[PDB]
Amino acid sequence: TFQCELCSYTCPRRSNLDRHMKSHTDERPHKCHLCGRAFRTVTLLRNHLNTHTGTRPHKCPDCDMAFVTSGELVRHRRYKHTHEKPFKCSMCDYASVEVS
DNA sequence: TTGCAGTGCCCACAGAGGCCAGCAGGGGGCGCTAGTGAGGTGGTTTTTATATGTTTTGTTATGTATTGTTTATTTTCCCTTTAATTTTAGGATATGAAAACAAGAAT
Ligand SMILES: [Zn+2]
Ligand SMILES: [Zn+2]
Ligand SMILES: [Zn+2]
Ligand SMILES: [Zn+2]
């Protein structure tokens, strides 16, 4: 029912349309007090500051290294600890942690 | 000793193959982020629900009006007895009208 004007975005929640309009309008009100980089939400700026300094809270349960976000630890476990490999190739027997 | 037939040696430029940097092939692991997606919390209203006040409905009691009841004073229908009232002779009256007499008038 809900439709977009800038693109063919179709959702059922008005709040989803609101966020999509915020993405089109690029409301970035969160700057970094070290570099000119800016973001739209607080968690992005929090991770950016957790990269300018070493304050990595997501610790690896199987080794002693760490990362700022969860997805990086997910893929680290699928590379090094639980070799998942969901996506597989066409001809060869290849598979890896990322679609890239 | 020489000409001829056959050998020795020294060089050198090719020929060859290992040495080497350069460079491209497939694949493993990390740094970082935009953008949804979903889930949880807070606010809002809202909707159901509950309780109070007012009014409407139902019930009760009293007074008035209607129908009925045996008196009860008309009233009215029906007797036997008078009290006017009417009808029928019977005698008397009256008022008329001829009748006779008397008085003018004529012949
Ligand atoms: Zn759009
Ligand atoms: Zn910065
Ligand atoms: Zn690890
Ligand atoms: Zn393949």
In whole angstroms, give the CA distance from residue A2 to residue A98.
33
How far the first Cα of chain A sits from its last, in Å, is 34
Q: Encode burial over A12-37: b for 16+ CB neighbours within 10 A, e otherwise.
A: eeeeebeebeeeeeeeeebeeeeeee
The nucleotide whose C1' lies nearest the CA of A92 is: B26
Residues A67 and A58: beta-carbon distance below 8 Å? yes
Q: In degrees to the nearest 10, what's the CA dihedral of A39, A40, A46, A51? A: -30
Residue A95 · residue A88 · CB < 8 Å: yes
Is A80 within 8 Å of A65 (Cβ atoms)? no
* Nearest ligand by distance to the CA of A64: 3
Task: For A50, list phi and psi in degrees, rounded to 5.
Answer: -75, -10
CA distance A72 to A92: 27
List the structure tokens of A47.
Answer: 């991770």
Q: How far is the CA of A74 from the centre of ligand 3 (A)?
A: 10
